[model samples]
Target: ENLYFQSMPEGLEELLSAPPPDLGAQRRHGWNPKDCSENIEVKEGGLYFERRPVAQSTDGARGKRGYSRGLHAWEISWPLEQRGTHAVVGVATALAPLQTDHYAALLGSNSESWGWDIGRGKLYHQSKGPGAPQYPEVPERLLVVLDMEEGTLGYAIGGTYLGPAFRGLKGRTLYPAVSAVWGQCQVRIRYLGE
Candidate 1:
C-alpha cells in the first residue's frame, strides 16, 4: 500500500482522479467528514497513512515480531482550545495488504517498517523489512494530516502488535487527539507498552 512522490513533484490533483488499486476499495459506501457546524472540522489538505516493522527488530538486536497492528496520528491535546478547527490532509502506506493467512499474522513480525513525509506537501507512505537502519524498533502504521495552513501537521495511532485501536477514534473525534508537527519534520517512536 506504498504511496510516494519523489522530490517535490506536482499534479497531486491528477493522482486523486486516478483510480486506486483494487485492494484500496472499501468494503462499503464511503464515509465523508461532517460540516464544521456539526462540531467536526472539515480538513481541506492532504493526508497520509502507512504501516511497517519497528526499528529494533530489523537490525537483529532484539527482534519481536508477529501479528502486530500499527496506527499513527497527531496528539493535539496541548492547545485544547484549538481542537476541532484542524483538518486532516491525507493517508498513505508502503506495506502490502494481507495476501495470505500466514503473511497476515506475520505482518508486523520480523522486519516491518512504515512512515510518511507530510512537510513535503505531498502525500506519501512506505514500509520495509528487517536488516535496515531506516527501520525502527516498533514498526508502525503512520497517519499524517496536512493542516489547512499547510504548516501544521497532526498525527496519532489506533493499534500496534495486535493492540487495540485508540480508545475514542471515530469520525471527527480524530482531530482533537493528534499532536501537531510544524516545519520540516521527522518523527521516531519506540513502544514502552508490554
Candidate 2:
C-alpha cells in the first residue's frame, strides 16, 4: 500500500495561489437615472438599489459608465432572504428599452440587451425563447464576465464559472444592468476590471 497521498495536483496549487483579480482599478458602477424607472431608488453612491418592495412593470437600471471594449467583470449580490422570481442582470445598450409592461421585457429580452433571468434560469435576447435551464436555485452572489475582445459574455455562481453564455457582442457600447419585477428585491454591485 502507498504511504503518501496527494491532496491536490501540482499545477493546481500554483493556480490556486495566484493573486486575486485586481479590482482596485474598478469602482462601484451605479444605476443610470435616465435609463431607469423613477421607482428605482439608488443609494450608497449608486452601489445599492435600495429596498423596493413592490414589483412595478419592467423597471431597469444601467451602469453610469458604458463599456465599448476591454474585459470587465462584476458581482451582483441578492440577499438570500430577498430573492425574487423576476430578477435580471446583464448588459444593455443605449437604445435598449428601459420600461415596458410586457412580462418578457427582461434584460436580455431584446436585440439591444443581453441578460440572464435569475429566477427563471433563462437566457434572453431579442425576445428569443429561453435556452437551456441555467440555475436550479438563485445564487446569493452572481459574477458576470464580459469579454469585449472575444465578444462573449459569461457568468458564474459563487465563484464557479458557468462557461460562455452569450456571444456576438463586439460592436456596441454596453452597460451593466439589472432589473426587478417583484417586491422587496434588492441588489448590490461591485466592479472587477481587466
Candidate 3:
C-alpha cells in the first residue's frame, strides 16, 4: 500500500505540547530588505510570504527570532502546481550574506547556511552542487525541524520523516530563512508553537 501511519516522535510531541513562544517575540522573522527585491510581500502577521514577481537578484528573508539552543520546528506550504529554478527553505546564520546577483544567493549556497530546494528536491550547502536526493516528490506541505542541541537539521514531507539532512549546527544562532526565484511563488509558514 502507498499509505502508512506512525505516531509522532517523543521529542516532537513534547516540543509541541509546551506553550508556544511569544508571537510578538517571533515578529523578528521577516524578509531581509537589503538582499531582496521590493516586490516580496510579508503578510499574515509575518507568517506568510505572498506571491510576487521574481527579479534578477534572488529574494530572501530571515526570521526575527534566532535559535541558540533547543529544538525548533515549523511548517511551510506552497501551491502544488508551482515550480521553478530555485525554491529554497532552510536556516542561516547572521553572517550569511543576504543578496546575490547569481543564483547562489539562494539559501544553502554559502558556508553560513543550509537549505533544501523544494523545486529540485536537492539539498545545498557551501554553494556546491546539490547533495543526494532529499525528497521523492514536490511536497505541498513541508515540516522542518532544527535540533540545536543535537546540531542537526531534518525534514518531513506530508508527515513522513526524511532523516537527517545536515549537521554541525551548534554554537551559532540560526534563523529561519527562505528564498525563491520563481515569478509565481508563495510560501506560508507556521511555527509549530502556541
Candidate 4:
C-alpha cells in the first residue's frame, strides 16, 4: 500500500490511459533489434537474444512492445548454464539505456530502468533497490511482472510469486528488458498475457 509517487513520471495518462499498441505495431512480442545495443543479436525471430563477445562491456535489449495500463509480465530466462556473469532481467522505460561502458547491469544502472540480476540473485535499480534473497541459483525460469495501475514491479521464480520488489513506478511506459555481459549466452523471453 505504498503507491504515493514522490514525483509522477512522464506521459502517464496519455501513454497508459491509451489503448494497447496496435496501429503502429505488429502481432509480435520479441525484442526490437532497432531498440537494442550494437552487441546484442536478436535471433530466432527476435525471441532469442545473444550478447556478442565482441566486447565485455554491458549490453542491453528491450522487447518491441511497451505497456502503460494493466498488469503485464514476461518470462525471461537463461536457457543454458550460467556460463557468464552479470545477467539482468526486468522492465525498463523507453528512456532506459541499452548499453553501458562497464560490465554492469545496464538496465538497473539508471533511473529509467529496474532489473533483477540473476547472476547475483539481487534486485537492482539505479544501483539501489530490493534484492530478494529467496530466488534460486542463477534463477529458475524468471518472471518479470509489472502492475501499471499501481506502479509496482514484482517477480516470480519457477512460477512462484515473490511479491513486489519495486514501487512508485507510476507514469512510465515500461518494456520487457534484459542486459547481459556473457558472450553468445542465450536469453529468451515470452510474453505472458495482461
User: What TM-score goes with each of the models?
Assistant: 0.18, 0.78, 0.79, 0.79
Clashes of 1: 48
In candidate 2, which residue ranges exceed 4 Å CA deviation? 1-28, 54-56, 102-105, 128-136
Pairs that clash in candidate 2: 53-183, 53-184, 110-126
| Every candidate's lDDT | 0.21, 0.67, 0.69, 0.72
Clashes of each: 48, 3, 5, 1
What TM-score number comes out for model 4?
0.79
Query: How much is the lDDT of residue 11 in candidate 1?
Result: 28
lDDT of 4: 0.72
**Candidate with the greatest TM-score versus the true structure:** 3
Q: Which TM-score value belongs to model 2?
A: 0.78
41-86 in candidate 4: lDDT tens per residue? 8887667788888665888888988888787766676854643667
Over the full model, what C-alpha lDDT does candidate 2 score relative to the true structure? 0.67
Across 1-194, the per-residue lDDT of candidate 3 in tens digits comes to 13212322338766656676566534444443333346567775666665466457566677767788887888778776654666788898887765567555368878888888877778888866635355437568887788887787777786665666788888989888877666657776678742
Per-model RMSD to reference: 18.3, 6.6, 4.0, 7.0
Candidate with the larger TM-score of 1 and 4: 4
- lDDT value, residue 75 of candidate 3: 78
On a 0 to 100 scale, what is the lDDT of residue 104 in model 3?
50
For model 2, where is the 10-residue window of minimal lDDT? Answer: 1-10
Candidate 3 clash total? 5
The list of candidate 4 runs beyond 4 A from truth reads: 1-27, 80-83, 128-140
lDDT of 3 at 172: 85
